[PDB]
Protein backbone atom coordinates (compact mmCIF):
# COMPACT_ATOMS: atom_id res chain seq x y z
CA UNK A 1 0.00 0.00 0.00
CA UNK A 2 1.47 3.32 -1.20
CA UNK A 3 -0.02 6.60 0.05
CA UNK A 4 0.70 10.23 -0.80
CA UNK A 5 2.26 11.79 2.31
CA UNK A 6 0.10 13.76 4.73
CA UNK A 7 0.88 17.46 4.35
CA UNK A 8 2.53 19.43 7.13
CA UNK A 9 -0.10 21.10 9.32
CA UNK A 10 1.44 24.48 8.37
CA UNK A 11 -0.06 24.09 4.85
CA UNK A 12 -3.58 23.68 6.33
CA UNK A 13 -5.14 27.01 7.40
CA UNK A 14 -7.62 27.46 10.26
CA UNK A 15 -10.97 29.29 10.12
CA UNK A 16 -10.60 32.42 12.27
CA UNK A 17 -12.97 33.01 15.19
CA UNK A 18 -14.71 29.66 14.75
CA UNK A 19 -18.37 29.79 15.84
CA UNK A 20 -19.11 26.21 16.94
CA UNK A 21 -22.84 26.95 17.34
CA UNK A 22 -23.12 28.27 13.75
CA UNK A 23 -21.39 25.18 12.30
CA UNK A 24 -24.22 22.97 13.66
CA UNK A 25 -26.64 21.22 11.31
CA UNK A 26 -26.70 19.12 8.15
CA UNK A 27 -23.93 19.50 5.57
CA UNK A 28 -23.77 17.82 2.15
CA UNK A 29 -20.50 16.27 0.97
CA UNK A 30 -20.28 17.96 -2.44
CA UNK A 31 -16.50 17.36 -2.74
CA UNK A 32 -14.05 14.72 -1.47
CA UNK A 33 -10.24 14.72 -1.74
CA UNK A 34 -7.63 12.53 -0.04
CA UNK A 35 -4.76 10.04 -0.28
CA UNK A 36 -7.17 7.11 0.23
CA UNK A 37 -9.83 8.58 -2.11
CA UNK A 38 -9.98 7.39 -5.75
CA UNK A 39 -12.08 8.40 -8.76
CA UNK A 40 -14.21 5.44 -9.94
CA UNK A 41 -15.91 5.96 -13.32
CA UNK A 42 -17.57 2.51 -13.16
CA UNK A 43 -19.31 3.16 -9.82
CA UNK A 44 -19.16 6.93 -9.04
CA UNK A 45 -19.37 8.05 -5.40
CA UNK A 46 -22.91 8.90 -4.24
CA UNK A 47 -23.43 12.05 -2.17
CA UNK A 48 -23.81 11.68 1.60
CA UNK A 49 -24.70 14.00 4.49
CA UNK A 50 -22.99 14.74 7.81
CA UNK A 51 -24.92 16.29 10.70
CA UNK A 52 -23.10 18.28 13.41
CA UNK A 53 -24.85 18.96 16.75
CA UNK A 54 -23.28 20.65 19.78
CA UNK A 55 -23.78 18.87 23.11
CA UNK A 56 -23.83 20.56 26.53
CA UNK A 57 -20.07 19.94 26.95
CA UNK A 58 -19.47 21.61 23.53
CA UNK A 59 -18.35 18.43 21.75
CA UNK A 60 -20.06 17.45 18.50
CA UNK A 61 -22.20 14.42 17.76
CA UNK A 62 -21.10 13.85 14.15
CA UNK A 63 -23.58 11.56 12.35
CA UNK A 64 -22.88 10.63 8.72
CA UNK A 65 -25.72 9.20 6.62
CA UNK A 66 -24.99 7.52 3.28
CA UNK A 67 -26.98 5.46 0.77
CA UNK A 68 -25.39 2.01 0.36
CA UNK A 69 -26.69 -1.47 -0.55
CA UNK A 70 -30.25 -0.11 -1.01
CA UNK A 71 -30.34 0.92 2.69
CA UNK A 72 -29.18 3.82 4.87
CA UNK A 73 -26.15 3.46 7.11
CA UNK A 74 -25.73 5.75 10.11
CA UNK A 75 -22.09 6.40 11.03
CA UNK A 76 -21.85 8.15 14.43
CA UNK A 77 -18.80 9.60 16.22
CA UNK A 78 -17.74 12.43 18.56
CA UNK A 79 -15.44 15.38 17.84
CA UNK A 80 -13.87 16.74 21.03
CA UNK A 81 -12.55 20.34 20.87
CA UNK A 82 -8.77 20.31 20.39
CA UNK A 83 -5.93 22.81 20.83
CA UNK A 84 -7.65 25.71 19.03
CA UNK A 85 -11.22 26.65 18.11
CA UNK A 86 -11.95 24.86 14.82
CA UNK A 87 -9.61 21.97 15.67
CA UNK A 88 -10.98 18.71 17.07
CA UNK A 89 -9.90 15.20 18.07
CA UNK A 90 -11.91 11.97 17.94
CA UNK A 91 -13.62 10.94 21.19
CA UNK A 92 -13.33 7.34 22.42
CA UNK A 93 -10.40 6.56 20.11
CA UNK A 94 -9.76 3.25 21.94
CA UNK A 95 -12.99 1.79 20.48
CA UNK A 96 -11.52 1.88 16.93
CA UNK A 97 -9.15 -1.07 16.18
CA UNK A 98 -5.78 0.28 14.98
CA UNK A 99 -6.60 4.00 15.21
CA UNK A 100 -3.86 5.75 17.20
CA UNK A 101 -4.56 9.34 16.07
CA UNK A 102 -7.29 11.54 14.57
CA UNK A 103 -7.26 15.27 13.74
CA UNK A 104 -9.97 17.54 12.35
CA UNK A 105 -9.43 21.15 11.28
CA UNK A 106 -12.07 23.50 9.84
CA UNK A 107 -10.10 25.26 7.09
CA UNK A 108 -12.75 27.81 6.08
CA UNK A 109 -16.52 28.32 6.32
CA UNK A 110 -19.25 30.96 6.03
CA UNK A 111 -21.56 28.71 8.11
CA UNK A 112 -24.69 29.08 5.91
CA UNK A 113 -23.43 28.01 2.46
CA UNK A 114 -20.07 26.20 2.50
CA UNK A 115 -17.16 24.78 4.48
CA UNK A 116 -13.82 23.03 3.92
CA UNK A 117 -12.71 20.63 6.65
CA UNK A 118 -9.29 18.96 6.80
CA UNK A 119 -9.14 15.49 8.40
CA UNK A 120 -6.07 13.39 9.27
CA UNK A 121 -6.10 9.88 10.76
CA UNK A 122 -3.36 7.40 11.68
CA UNK A 123 -4.76 3.87 11.44
CA UNK A 124 -2.58 0.74 11.34
CA UNK A 125 0.45 3.11 11.33
CA UNK A 126 -0.72 4.37 7.91
CA UNK A 127 -1.16 8.16 7.77
CA UNK A 128 -4.41 9.03 5.96
CA UNK A 129 -5.66 12.55 5.24
CA UNK A 130 -8.68 14.03 3.45
CA UNK A 131 -10.41 17.33 2.69
CA UNK A 132 -14.22 17.39 2.42
CA UNK A 133 -16.00 20.24 0.65
CA UNK A 134 -19.15 20.72 2.70
CA UNK A 135 -22.19 22.35 1.08
CA UNK A 136 -25.37 23.54 2.77
CA UNK A 137 -27.26 22.67 -0.41
CA UNK A 138 -26.39 19.74 -2.71
CA UNK A 139 -25.07 22.08 -5.43
CA UNK A 140 -22.29 24.67 -5.13
CA UNK A 141 -20.77 27.28 -7.44
CA UNK A 142 -17.94 26.48 -9.87
CA UNK A 143 -15.73 29.00 -8.06
CA UNK A 144 -16.12 27.20 -4.71
CA UNK A 145 -15.45 23.83 -6.37
CA UNK A 146 -12.40 25.15 -8.29
CA UNK A 147 -11.10 26.64 -5.02
CA UNK A 148 -11.50 23.19 -3.43
CA UNK A 149 -9.61 21.62 -6.35
CA UNK A 150 -6.87 24.25 -5.97
CA UNK A 151 -6.49 23.67 -2.20
CA UNK A 152 -6.51 19.87 -2.57
CA UNK A 153 -3.66 20.12 -5.10
CA UNK A 154 -1.67 22.43 -2.79
CA UNK A 155 -1.54 19.44 -0.40
CA UNK A 156 -0.04 17.09 -3.03
CA UNK A 157 -3.23 15.41 -4.28
CA UNK A 158 -3.60 14.85 -8.06
CA UNK A 159 -6.84 15.09 -10.07
CA UNK A 160 -7.89 11.42 -9.76
CA UNK A 161 -7.70 11.74 -5.95
CA UNK A 162 -10.44 14.43 -6.03
CA UNK A 163 -14.08 13.37 -6.49
CA UNK A 164 -17.40 15.22 -6.50
CA UNK A 165 -20.15 12.89 -5.21
CA UNK A 166 -23.27 12.83 -7.40
CA UNK A 167 -26.42 14.30 -5.74
CA UNK A 168 -29.11 11.84 -4.61
CA UNK A 169 -32.48 12.05 -2.83
CA UNK A 170 -32.20 8.83 -0.78
CA UNK A 171 -31.75 9.53 2.95
CA UNK A 172 -29.63 12.72 2.74
CA UNK A 173 -32.91 14.69 2.73
CA UNK A 174 -34.75 15.16 6.04
O1 LIG B 1 -9.83 8.44 3.71
C2 LIG B 1 -10.14 8.10 4.84
N3 LIG B 1 -10.60 6.87 5.13
C4 LIG B 1 -10.80 5.82 4.14
C5 LIG B 1 -10.26 4.51 4.70
O6 LIG B 1 -9.07 4.61 5.48
C7 LIG B 1 -9.15 4.75 6.93
O8 LIG B 1 -8.69 5.79 7.38
C9 LIG B 1 -9.73 3.72 7.88
N10 LIG B 1 -10.65 4.38 8.80
C11 LIG B 1 -10.25 5.05 9.88
O12 LIG B 1 -9.07 5.16 10.19
C13 LIG B 1 -11.26 5.73 10.77
C14 LIG B 1 -11.36 5.37 12.11
C15 LIG B 1 -12.28 6.01 12.93
C16 LIG B 1 -13.09 7.01 12.42
C17 LIG B 1 -12.99 7.38 11.08
O18 LIG B 1 -13.79 8.36 10.58
C19 LIG B 1 -12.07 6.74 10.26
O20 LIG B 1 -11.98 7.11 8.95
C21 LIG B 1 -10.45 2.52 7.21
O22 LIG B 1 -11.89 2.52 7.24
C23 LIG B 1 -12.77 3.61 6.79
O24 LIG B 1 -12.70 4.68 7.37
C25 LIG B 1 -13.77 3.46 5.66
N26 LIG B 1 -14.55 4.69 5.57
C27 LIG B 1 -15.59 4.93 6.38
O28 LIG B 1 -15.96 4.13 7.23
C29 LIG B 1 -16.32 6.23 6.25
C30 LIG B 1 -17.49 6.33 5.50
C31 LIG B 1 -18.15 7.55 5.42
C32 LIG B 1 -17.65 8.67 6.08
C33 LIG B 1 -16.48 8.57 6.83
O34 LIG B 1 -15.99 9.66 7.48
C35 LIG B 1 -15.83 7.35 6.92
O36 LIG B 1 -14.68 7.26 7.65
C37 LIG B 1 -13.12 3.21 4.30
O38 LIG B 1 -12.89 4.38 3.48
C39 LIG B 1 -12.28 5.65 3.87
O40 LIG B 1 -13.02 6.62 3.97
C41 LIG B 1 -10.02 9.08 5.96
C42 LIG B 1 -8.85 9.83 6.12
C43 LIG B 1 -8.75 10.74 7.17
C44 LIG B 1 -9.81 10.92 8.05
C45 LIG B 1 -10.97 10.18 7.88
O46 LIG B 1 -12.02 10.34 8.73
C47 LIG B 1 -11.08 9.27 6.84
O48 LIG B 1 -12.23 8.56 6.70
FE1 LIG C 1 -13.56 8.67 8.33
NA1 LIG D 1 -14.88 9.20 3.27
- For residue 37, the enclosing domain spans 1-174
SS3 letters for the chain? CCCCCCCCHHHCCCCCCCCCCCCCEEEEEEEEEECCCCCCCCCCCECCEEEECECCCCCEEEEEEEEECCEEEEEEEEEEECCCCCEEEECCHHHCCCEEEEEEEEEEECCCCEEEEEEEEEECCEEEEEEEEEECCCCCCHHHHHHHHHHHHHCCCCHHHEECCECCCCCCCC
Ligand 3 centroid, distance to 48 Cα (angstroms): 9
Q: State which approach was used to obtain the coordinates.
A: X-ray
CATH number at residue 140: 2.40.128.20
Q: Which of 121, 127, 134 to mutate to test the pocket of ligand 1 (most atoms within 8 A of CB)?
A: 121
Q: Resolution limit in angstroms?
A: 2.8
Q: Is 10 exposed, middle or buried (0-12, 13-18, 19+ CB in 10 A)?
A: exposed
The structural domain count of the chain equals 1
Note the ligand closest to the C-alpha atom of 91. 1
Amino acid sequence: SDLIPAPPLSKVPLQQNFQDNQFQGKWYVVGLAGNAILREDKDPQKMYATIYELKEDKSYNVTSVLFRKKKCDYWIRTFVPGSQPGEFTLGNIKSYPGLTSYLVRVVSTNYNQHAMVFFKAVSQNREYFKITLYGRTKELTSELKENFIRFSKSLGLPENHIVFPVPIDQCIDG
